[PDB]
Enzyme design. Structure first.
Site, mmCIF file in Angstrom:
data_model
loop_
_atom_site.group_PDB
_atom_site.id
_atom_site.type_symbol
_atom_site.label_atom_id
_atom_site.label_comp_id
_atom_site.label_asym_id
_atom_site.label_seq_id
_atom_site.Cartn_x
_atom_site.Cartn_y
_atom_site.Cartn_z
ATOM 1 C CG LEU A 243 -2.361 0.145 1.152
ATOM 2 C CD1 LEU A 243 -2.859 -0.409 -0.152
ATOM 3 C CD2 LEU A 243 -2.987 -0.571 2.324
ATOM 4 N N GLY A 244 2.086 1.124 0.536
ATOM 5 C CA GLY A 244 2.978 2.263 0.576
ATOM 6 C C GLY A 244 4.114 2.005 1.535
ATOM 7 C CB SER A 245 7.588 2.215 1.427
ATOM 8 O OG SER A 245 7.465 0.897 0.925
ATOM 9 C CB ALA B 205 7.726 5.833 5.964
ATOM 10 C CG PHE B 206 12.757 2.794 8.775
ATOM 11 C CD1 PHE B 206 13.776 3.084 7.875
ATOM 12 C CD2 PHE B 206 12.850 1.640 9.551
ATOM 13 C CE1 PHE B 206 14.871 2.238 7.743
ATOM 14 C CE2 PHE B 206 13.943 0.783 9.425
ATOM 15 C CZ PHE B 206 14.955 1.083 8.519
ATOM 16 N N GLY B 207 8.662 1.817 7.529
ATOM 17 C CA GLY B 207 7.737 0.766 7.846
ATOM 18 C C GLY B 207 7.022 0.611 6.533
ATOM 19 C CB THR B 208 6.759 -1.807 4.073
ATOM 20 O OG1 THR B 208 5.930 -2.233 2.992
ATOM 21 C CG2 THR B 208 7.231 -3.001 4.886
ATOM 22 C CE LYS C 134 3.920 2.341 10.148
ATOM 23 N NZ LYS C 134 3.833 3.362 11.241
ATOM 24 C CG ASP D 103 2.369 14.928 12.288
ATOM 25 O OD1 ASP D 103 2.527 16.071 11.816
ATOM 26 O OD2 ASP D 103 2.577 13.886 11.623
ATOM 27 N NE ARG E 252 2.280 15.099 7.678
ATOM 28 C CZ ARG E 252 2.264 16.426 7.496
ATOM 29 N NH1 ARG E 252 1.846 16.916 6.327
ATOM 30 N NH2 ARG E 252 2.619 17.273 8.469
ATOM 31 C CG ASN E 253 -0.631 12.091 9.968
ATOM 32 O OD1 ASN E 253 -0.134 11.206 9.235
ATOM 33 N ND2 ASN E 253 0.108 12.971 10.653
ATOM 34 C CG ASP F 279 1.089 9.354 11.240
ATOM 35 O OD1 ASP F 279 1.996 9.692 12.047
ATOM 36 O OD2 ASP F 279 1.309 8.880 10.090
HETATM 37 N N1 LIG Z 1 -4.925 1.956 7.490
HETATM 38 C C1 LIG Z 1 -4.486 2.295 6.281
HETATM 39 N N2 LIG Z 1 -5.209 2.017 5.184
HETATM 40 C C2 LIG Z 1 -4.789 2.390 3.991
HETATM 41 N N3 LIG Z 1 -3.650 3.045 3.817
HETATM 42 C C3 LIG Z 1 -2.875 3.354 4.866
HETATM 43 C C4 LIG Z 1 -3.285 2.977 6.136
HETATM 44 N N4 LIG Z 1 -2.353 3.383 6.991
HETATM 45 C C5 LIG Z 1 -1.400 3.994 6.290
HETATM 46 N N5 LIG Z 1 -1.709 3.980 4.996
HETATM 47 C C6 LIG Z 1 -0.880 4.555 3.907
HETATM 48 O O1 LIG Z 1 0.263 3.724 3.639
HETATM 49 C C7 LIG Z 1 1.378 4.578 3.323
HETATM 50 C C8 LIG Z 1 2.381 4.520 4.480
HETATM 51 O O2 LIG Z 1 1.789 4.922 5.718
HETATM 52 P P1 LIG Z 1 2.677 4.965 7.062
HETATM 53 O O3 LIG Z 1 3.277 3.656 7.408
HETATM 54 O O4 LIG Z 1 1.714 5.510 8.234
HETATM 55 O O5 LIG Z 1 3.801 6.097 6.824
HETATM 56 P P2 LIG Z 1 3.603 7.612 7.336
HETATM 57 O O6 LIG Z 1 2.198 7.987 7.616
HETATM 58 O O7 LIG Z 1 4.259 8.541 6.198
HETATM 59 N N6 LIG Z 1 4.559 7.786 8.638
HETATM 60 P P3 LIG Z 1 4.069 6.824 9.851
HETATM 61 O O8 LIG Z 1 2.598 6.735 9.990
HETATM 62 O O9 LIG Z 1 4.764 7.398 11.185
HETATM 63 O O10 LIG Z 1 4.747 5.388 9.586
HETATM 64 C C9 LIG Z 1 0.810 5.995 3.221
HETATM 65 O O11 LIG Z 1 0.231 6.206 1.931
HETATM 66 C C10 LIG Z 1 -0.285 5.913 4.283
HETATM 67 O O12 LIG Z 1 -1.239 6.952 4.045
#
Ligand SMILES: Nc1ncnc2c1ncn2[C@@H]1O[C@H](COP(=O)(O)OP(=O)(O)NP(=O)(O)O)[C@@H](O)[C@H]1O
Ligand SMILES: Nc1ncnc2c1ncn2[C@@H]1O[C@H](COP(=O)(O)OP(=O)(O)NP(=O)(O)O)[C@@H](O)[C@H]1O
Lengths: 294, 294
Positions: free
Chosen positions: A23-25, A26-29, A49, A141, A145-146, A159
């Site tokens: 879905l997307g990747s 920060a330092f967690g995927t 995550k 925060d 975006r959050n 977030d």
């Molecule tokens: N529950 C979710 N459902 C769908 N997409 C999500 C969800 N949570 C996060 N994302 C998306 O997945 C990608 C990574 O999110 P995320 O791991 O939260 O990184 P971040 O918001 O930039 N920093 P962080 O939240 O501290 O790790 C971004 O596009 C988020 O918006």
């Protein structure tokens, strides 16, 4: 020194769920996936995550902090943690927010977003914030975006790991100057959040380098009035940006105001075509997280 | 290759002490008794462990190893050896812990144990563990059964004979899979120990056969949240069970955390009636081991 946080932390079995696609990747995927509680013949769309394949005493310690918080909340407009998996790398399981962060969504959909949606989002976000305020929790925060989108009709605050009991452009002055954060400086970011939604996803102070903000805001300058915004809505944004934090509005008031406006959207937001706007594997046992109680 | 262990091994005369009554039997029988140092007009309540009337080159060699360790320690939360007697059968003399192992004690006293006691035990146990860690010593069988109770207010770590410089259910994964043991896998057992105290003496994974654990823990499963436990306390237990040993907490941190909580017990442990809990021959020359120095 208040009440005992008796929230339950649900530990999930690696097998109980399966990833489907990134879905997307920060330092967690983060992956999109399904979860099938022990023996329940129910499938739950979720987000998984997973700390990068690394595991640094700091990275591993942050995700857990986030888990602590998410688990300690329960409101329709705040992302709740579903459980975590203690595998080689830790995995947080939250409810799937199909449409992603609200920021991208207003951008990707300007031409179809009406005043009703916008205003309801302001109401919803403020409700979640007021909830956090009740739980004496300070999201630190809050930004477009959050905020995640479950459906165009239902957003939720997320977030708030960095939350307590950098985005200088969304920060109140007290925070920027003396790292001070109260529910009131949360209001300031609420103001900017709202401001992003009305400018259909613009960057606050685009151009101005982080270094200038402190002084700027001190002069008396602010973000401009978004075009679709009547002076009524803009007025509220502005109030959220008072240098004196106690002279800013309270989320429960913000709820009250935006709701009033929500009852006659076209009077407070002027949008061309507002009137004609419109927004959106066996899945027999699918249940949204919101219906999978206790 | 470190410093010289200059601890003194005190050899006692068969006559200097007298057994009073059996305390329990394993392959060594422990008696409750008194010891009267050479010429001192002081009587010391002690425990006398005597290898069974046997004497096998292996059994006799283990008890001595235990003696070596116990003699090399000195901390308020670690059982110290008092001396040994080289009679037909070897006898270890340790301080009498009147109330027995902590495991039985929480069981036998659930209805009267409050959060303050529980939390102080966690602090005390962690102090003893940190002590062993300083002495680069790895207890390799930390469990509620191996914590003795001097008084309800003072426990001490014991049974670290098997210790180095089986209970698979208290073992970290690295230990179970590759017989690896560090101070960190000690933390894992600390977690289970704590978990026994909060469940007032329950059996970890009761039902699950030793054979399954390795796989289970690998999936991502753990011991459940004890009822009296706020998510704060449970969180800590969980951290002690991270697959990555360096991402688990350090005893000195465990001390710090449980102490914080110890200052406002009712906020971290919810126990019905916590507020109303309460816990307990010429003996003129009696002195507890703890006051009989050098
Ligand atoms: N529950 C979710 N459902 C769908 N997409 C999500 C969800 N949570 C996060 N994302 C998306 O997945 C990608 C990574 O999110 P995320 O791991 O939260 O990184 P971040 O918001 O930039 N920093 P962080 O939240 O501290 O790790 C971004 O596009 C988020 O918006
Ligand atoms: N110092 C002590 N004071 C009071 N009771 C003790 C003391 N030491 C041991 N006991 C108890 O006496 C019984 C036998 O203990 P023990 O000889 O240590 O067998 P064990 O702990 O099962 N295995 P091990 O310690 O290796 O011999 C158990 O109930 C112990 O908890």
């Amino acid at each position: 020194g208040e009440a005992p946080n008796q929230a339950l932390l649900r530990i999930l079995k690696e097998t109980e769920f399966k990833k489907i696609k990134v879905l997307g990747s920060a330092f967690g995927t983060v992956y999109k996936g399904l979860w099938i509680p022990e023996g329940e013949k129910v499938k739950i769309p979720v987000a998984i995550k997973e700390l990068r394949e690394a595991t640094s005493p700091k990275a591993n310690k942050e995700i857990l902090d986030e888990a602590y918080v998410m688990a300690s909340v329960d409101n329709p407009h705040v992302c709740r943690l579903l459980g975590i998996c203690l595998t080689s790398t830790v995995q947080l399981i939250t409810q799937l927010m199909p449409f992603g962060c609200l920021l991208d969504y207003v951008r990707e959909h300007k031409d179809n977003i009406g005043s009703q949606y916008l205003l309801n989002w302001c109401v919803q976000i403020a409700k979640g914030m007021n909830y956090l305020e009740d739980r004496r929790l300070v999201h630190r925060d809050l930004a477009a975006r959050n905020v995640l989108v479950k459906t165009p009709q239902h957003v939720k605050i997320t977030d708030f790991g960095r939350a307590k009991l950098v985005p200088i452009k969304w920060m109140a002055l007290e925070s920027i100057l003396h790292r001070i954060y109260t529910h009131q400086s949360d209001v300031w970011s609420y103001g900017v959040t709202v401001w992003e939604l009305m400018t259909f996803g613009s960057k606050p102070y685009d151009g101005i380098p982080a270094s200038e903000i402190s002084s700027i805001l001190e002069k008396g300058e602010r973000l401009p009035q978004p075009p679709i915004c009547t002076i009524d809505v803009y007025m509220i944004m502005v109030k959220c940006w008072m240098i004196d934090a106690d002279s800013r509005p309270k989320f429960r008031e913000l709820i009250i105001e935006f709701s009033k406006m929500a009852r006659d959207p076209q009077r407070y937001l002027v949008i061309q075509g507002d009137e004609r706007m419109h927004l959106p594997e066996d899945m027999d046992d699918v249940v949204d997280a919101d219906e999978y109680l206790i």
